[PDB]
């Protein structure tokens, strides 16, 4: 559960991400697939070669969902219903994988906003991602 402070930190970090959300979204997938090769099993139909237009397009999808979540920090389950549906019910993604993408996403933000990625912001972003992960892996509908 996020503090009021977490919510502000998440919003601040995200404002810095701004128009690069998609790019960061794409790099993160990219880092996950490379560091954690078992995640690839979920994308048998994807071109997973380095630089894939497919991974890029998918990164934008992911980034787009995260911005949606940032905007609805007070009702994530409400905000990401369609997504749990897909991830929990449809794809049955093992929860461990969500920890791989989160890590990948922090690695990505850290490298691009070294100034902004303070320990406090790092702490709040981690919590937020744990929160989204929980919503996406829960069958509450």
């Amino acid at each position: 559960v996020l503090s009021a402070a977490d919510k502000g930190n998440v919003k601040a970090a995200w404002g810095k991400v701004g128009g690069h959300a998609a790019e960061y979204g794409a790099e993160a997938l990219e880092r996950m697939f490379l560091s954690f090769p078992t995640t690839k099993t979920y994308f048998p139909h994807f071109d997973l070669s380095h630089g894939s237009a497919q991974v890029k397009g998918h990164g934008a999808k992911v980034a787009a969902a995260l911005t949606k979540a940032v905007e609805h920090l007070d009702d994530l389950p409400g905000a990401l219903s369609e997504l749990s549906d897909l991830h929990a019910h449809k794809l049955r993604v093992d929860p461990v994988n969500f920890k791989l993408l989160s890590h990948s996403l922090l690695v990505t933000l850290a490298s691009h906003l070294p100034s902004d990625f303070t320990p406090a912001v790092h702490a709040s972003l981690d919590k937020f991602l744990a929160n989204v992960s929980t919503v996406l892996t829960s069958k509450y509908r």
Binding site: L106, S111, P114, A120
Partner: protein
Amino acid sequence: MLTAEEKAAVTAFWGKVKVDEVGGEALGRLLVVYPWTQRFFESFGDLSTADAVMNNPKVKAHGKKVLDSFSNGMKHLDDLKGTFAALSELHCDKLHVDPENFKLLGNVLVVVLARNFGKEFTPVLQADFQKVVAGVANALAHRYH
């Protein structure tokens, strides 16, 4: 573990790592990001806030000790179980550190390298680095498995 390819990569990059600084930043972020870990360093003084934690001299000092252990492991990449037997013993047997925590520190380590190297710490380089930390974490958790 790493192939010779990867051994080389990991080794070259490491050459550029400022153990002092990275170490202190890694330990500090651990304590701030995963607050319950603070319970093991109660003796370090004030860990009240991020600022306090990051600026705690004992934290800074200990971060170095750790990274030092890391540097050594890097040298004995093919026998991490042995190189860390002693630590495994301390942390598992004496400290009773839950081994999940070993994964958290390594992960924090990777985030710090990324913050400090930017574009230099590529997806491909990170990938190699992940095997190392996984290795170190498994070697430390040895007394369990």
